[PDB]
Structure formats: structure tokens, C-alpha cells
């Protein structure tokens, strides 16, 4: 950069902290283990004549 | 005679009586019932459901497979309980009558 004659100030400015990055983090992972069941029954008493 | 809607038509004279001369200490006289009614079916209708409510999510189950039983054992035991709901339901309102001679009409169908 152009400027004043003789010695000029010696300045670094690279910011240390990480930028935006791929860590979305909040995703569904483990629902509780859950099976549905249709169920059935059939009445079975003595049935003579 | 009064509670005719509470007894079962195909088991005549529904009583076993016993009678001891000797009362409790301090009692004049007393009675003790035993009854076997289809009306207790509520317990099994509720507990197989309160248990189903657990198996539908497998909730608390790891304390039980934690002693080495199988994940099948609890369905077996509910299913043993479901057939006992059919057991109370099959003597509910029951008849005992001739076969192939009849098929049922009621008095109206429409609500």
C-alpha cells in the first residue's frame, strides 16, 4: 500500500475464530423403540348339541 | 329371585353353602362371600391395555431383560391375558341350545 516516506507500521489482522462451518448439530437421531400391533381374539366355549 | 340378571341360566342353583356353629372372638354371627362373576373382566381389560401402553414404546423393559428374560416373554404373558378376556366374554350373556335349527333375529336393527 502506498504511503509516507521511511518506516511504516507492521500490522497483521488474521482473525482466529472459525467461520460458519457445517455443524448444523440439531437433527433427530434416536426416537424411542416403538412397535404398533393390531390384535385379535376368538371366543371358544364348549359348543355341543 | 331379585338378582336374576346377575346369574347364569345354564348353572342351576348357584350356591355352595357352609355353616360353622362357632363365630369369631366377640362376634355373634358373620358371613363370608366368594363369587366368580364375569364382571371382574375390567381388571384384565385395563391391565393388558396399561401393559400394551408400555410395550407400544418398550418403556421400562430394560429393567426386565436386565434379569435375562426375552423380549418375547411379555407378549406371551399379555397374550395369555387376552385369551382370559375371551374366557370371561364367552360366558357373558351365554346360552346353551340346539345347533343348525336356528339363526338369530332381534326386534329391530336401526338405531
Swiss-Prot record, chain A:
Expressed in neurons. Isoform PNS-tau is expressed in the peripheral nervous system while the others are expressed in the central nervous system. It is found in: Cytoplasm, Cytosol; Cell membrane; Cytoplasm, Cytoskeleton; Cell projection, Axon. The record marks 23, 39 as: Not glycated. It comes from the Eukaryota. The modification Phosphoserine is found at residues 1, 13, 34, 36. Interacts with MARK1, MARK2, MARK3 and MARK4. Interacts with PSMC2 through SQSTM1. Interacts with SQSTM1 when polyubiquitinated. Interacts with FKBP4. Binds to CSNK1D. Interacts with SGK1. Interacts with PIN1. Interacts with LRRK2. Interacts with LRP1, leading to endocytosis; this interaction is reduced in the presence of LRPAP1/RAP. This is Microtubule-associated protein tau. It comes from Homo sapiens (Human). The chain holds residues 519 to 567 of 758 of the full protein.
Curated annotation (Swiss-Prot), chain B:
GO terms for molecular function: GTP binding; GTPase activity; metal ion binding; structural constituent of cytoskeleton. The keyword RNA-binding does not apply. GO terms for cellular component: cytoplasm; microtubule. It is found in: Cytoplasm, Cytoskeleton. GO terms for biological process: microtubule cytoskeleton organization; mitotic cell cycle; neuron migration. The modification 5-glutamyl polyglutamate is found at residue 104. This is Tubulin beta chain. The chain holds residues 335 to 445 of 445 of the full protein. It comes from the Eukaryota. It comes from Sus scrofa. Residues 95-111 have a biased composition (Acidic residues).
Amino acid at each position: 500500500s502506498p504511503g509516507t516516506p521511511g518506516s511504516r507500521s507492521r500490522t497483521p489482522s488474521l482473525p482466529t475464530p472459525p467461520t460458519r462451518e457445517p455443524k448444523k448439530v440439531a437433527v433427530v437421531r434416536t426416537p424411542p423403540k416403538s412397535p404398533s400391533s393390531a390384535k385379535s381374539r376368538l371366543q371358544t366355549a364348549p359348543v355341543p348339541m | 329371585n331379585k338378582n336374576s340378571s346377575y346369574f347364569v341360566e345354564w348353572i342351576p342353583n348357584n350356591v355352595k353353602t357352609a355353616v360353622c356353629d362357632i363365630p369369631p372372638r366377640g362376634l355373634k354371627m358373620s358371613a363370608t362371600f366368594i363369587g366368580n362373576s364375569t364382571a371382574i373382566q375390567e381388571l384384565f381389560k385395563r391391565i393388558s391395555e396399561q401393559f400394551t401402553a408400555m410395550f407400544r414404546r418398550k418403556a421400562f423393559l430394560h429393567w426386565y431383560t436386565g434379569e435375562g428374560m426375552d423380549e418375547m416373554e411379555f407378549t406371551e404373558a399379555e397374550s395369555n391375558m387376552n385369551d382370559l378376556v375371551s374366557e370371561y366374554q364367552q360366558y357373558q350373556d351365554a346360552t346353551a341350545d340346539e345347533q343348525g335349527e336356528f339363526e338369530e333375529e332381534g326386534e329391530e336393527d336401526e338405531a
